[PDB]
Structure formats: structure tokens, C-alpha cells
Amino acid sequence: DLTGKKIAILAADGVEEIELTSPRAAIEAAGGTTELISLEPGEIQSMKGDIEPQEKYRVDHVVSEVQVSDYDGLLLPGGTVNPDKLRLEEGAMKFVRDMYDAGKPIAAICHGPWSLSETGIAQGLKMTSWSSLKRELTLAGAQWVDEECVTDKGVVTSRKPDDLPAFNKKIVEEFAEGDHSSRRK
Amino acid sequence: DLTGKKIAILAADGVEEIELTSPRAAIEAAGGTTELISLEPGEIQSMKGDIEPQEKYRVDHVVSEVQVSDYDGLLLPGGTVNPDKLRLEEGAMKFVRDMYDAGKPIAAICHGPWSLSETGIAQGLKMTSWSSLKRELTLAGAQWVDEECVTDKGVVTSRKPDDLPAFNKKIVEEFAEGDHSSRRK
Ligand SMILES: [Mg+2]
Numbered sequence: 001d002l003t004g005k006k007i008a009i010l011a012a013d014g015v016e017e018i019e020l021t022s023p024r025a026a027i028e029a030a031g032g033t034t035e036l037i038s039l040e041p042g043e044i045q046s047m048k049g050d051i052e053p054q055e056k057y058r059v060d061h062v063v064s065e066v067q068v069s070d071y072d073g074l075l076l077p078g079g080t081v082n083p084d085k086l087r088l089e090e091g092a093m094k095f096v097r098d099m100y101d102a103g104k105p106i107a108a109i110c111h112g113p114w115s116l117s118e119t120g121i122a123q124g125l126k127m128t129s130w131s132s133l134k135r136e137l138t139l140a141g142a143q144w145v146d147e148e149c150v151t152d153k154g155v156v157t158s159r160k161p162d163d164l165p166a167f168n169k170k171i172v173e174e175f176a177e178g179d180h181s182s183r184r185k
Numbered sequence: 186d187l188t189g190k191k192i193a194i195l196a197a198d199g200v201e202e203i204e205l206t207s208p209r210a211a212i213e214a215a216g217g218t219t220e221l222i223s224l225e226p227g228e229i230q231s232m233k234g235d236i237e238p239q240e241k242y243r244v245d246h247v248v249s250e251v252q253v254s255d256y257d258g259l260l261l262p263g264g265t266v267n268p269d270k271l272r273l274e275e276g277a278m279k280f281v282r283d284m285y286d287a288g289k290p291i292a293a294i295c296h297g298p299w300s301l302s303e304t305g306i307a308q309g310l311k312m313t314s315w316s317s318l319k320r321e322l323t324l325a326g327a328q329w330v331d332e333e334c335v336t337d338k339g340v341v342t343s344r345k346p347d348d349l350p351a352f353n354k355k356i357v358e359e360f361a362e363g364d365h366s367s368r369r370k
Binding site for chain 1: 198199230232235236237238265266269270272273296302303316317320321324325
């Protein structure tokens, strides 16, 4: 049950459509709400298979316009271009790090984990991702595994759209359990 | 100064258009020729700014069909999705590794240097790239700097489309010289 819980979805242009819409649908189905947070105001271009433009999604706030205390969790959807744009923006990376340091549950799927590497979160973390992130994540000090869904220290990761059924269940469990500060000391 | 020199261009779907077409035109203007090498037959999808689909370009050869001795050099264009796709294919990474190990000049622009990380070439290399690759290239053991065009061990790197004029000028003088297996020992 996510009644009264609000989840931040951090995403730029290039986000994999299904990796935004399907977990968002799980969060609302569990009774929670989500808000789409981004670099610039307006809309964000979603993709299918990284390069086929699909629908556009309205951004609720720019990253500098929100605080960590407004949210009970963080979702980092993939699509190759999206996290690659996010990792270059200081306010974006500060928000991801701050979310973590405040004990808030974090879910990243597919290319999404790139933000966990940029912020240093990956270091000593058990996690998965899309196969192309294996190198950077292992170099970054991660305990990288190839599994459909991995949870460590309130951080949920998955590899791909087909992991969504298992990811959606796990993200809801973790968003519901709440503050993981004590597991991150 | 490239008459009789043939340059292999390795690119997948998601290739930044100008990073394919501009260096190719500079090679052809120099008297040289190029061939587009890829993962699958037919065409690849080029993009503008990573996410706006532009023109499709015809593939000449699949990567698991061509020989190193066939070429005098290697171009690795960027666009985010393309090297991310390229780096998961063993055939494609073995081909960029054999080109290096035989001493042939290599040029990589923007996200293109990802293949140089996957393949171990980035270790001990002075190089640049699009800014988002800084973290991985650093952890891979590269000497990463923020510069217009870097050449080391006959590997030419540049950051972005703005760097095209300098990149293009450098690659023509590097493809002209050839055989750097003495510098990579
Ligand atoms: Mg937990």
C-alpha cells in the first residue's frame, strides 16, 4: 500500500516509454502517486527500443524546483539517451544522491542505473542493469549480477522491459517499507 | 592525402548523422574511400541530437564478414545509442581490437570512444570524448582531458560536432601516416 506516498520519476528526453509508464502504473495501482521530474520544463520525448520516438510526457517540475522531503521514493527509468543526459546535470545528480543519503528507496531499470554510478551510489552495491552498463558499474565498485530483480540497501534494479513484472512488485514492497537510512549507514 | 586508403566505419542504429557523414566527406575529399561496417545487413538509422530519426544509410558489410587487412583505418562515430549497441557484440569489439593491435589509425568522436573502453584500448590512453563518458573512461584507466581533438598512439578522439573541423583535419593526417603498432608496444 502506497496511499499517501509520492514517488519522483527522474527522466530526460530519450526515456524508454514502457519503463516510465509500467512502473508508474504499478505505483498508482498500489495507491501511490508519481510526479515526473526533469531537466527542463514542458515535455519529454519517450522512445521505443531507444530510437523510435513515441509519446511525449509532461514534466511536473524541473529538478531545481523540488526538494527530497516531498518524496517517499525515486524511480530512474532507462532508455539509453535519458540517463546519459541526466548524468551531466549537477542538480539532477545532487537530487539522486540526496534521495539516497536521506534513506529514500530507489528503483532504477535498464540504462537507469547510470545515475547510481555517477553519484557514487553503485560502490559496494549489489545490483543489476542492462548488459552494456556492466563494465562501468563493475569498475565503479558494484557487486554486479545478471538477475531480473535485485534489491540491496533499499535500491531496486532490473535489466530490461521483460523484468517489469518482477521489478514492479519489488519497487512497491520497497516504497512501502520506507526509510532505509539504517541499512545505508 | 588519402588516395588508395580505405577507411572502415563501424556504426549501428542510433548513429549521430553528422558524425558519420562529415568525416566520411573529409576522407573522400582527401582522395580516400570508406565502407560502412555494422551488426546486421541493410541500413542503419541515423539520428539528429540522439533522438530525432534522420536518414537511413546502407550497410556495406556485416562485422563478422570483413578483414582487418582490408582497411587502412577505422572511424568510430558517436550518437548515444550506437556505441551502446556496438559494445555488446563480440564480433564488433574483436574487430576494433584487431584494428588496434595491427597498428591501424583509429578515430572516435563523441560517444564513439565507448568501444575503446569495452575493448581495453582506453587503458593508458590520452584521450577525450563527449563529457558523459568521462567517468567510465577514467575508471578504465584513460588519461581523460576536455579538449577539441586529442591524438595518442594514433588514436584520434574528439568530443562533439563542434570539433568536426579539427577532428576531420587530424584524421586525414593520421590516416595518411599509418602503422602505430610501434607506439602501442
Ligand atoms: Mg528493503
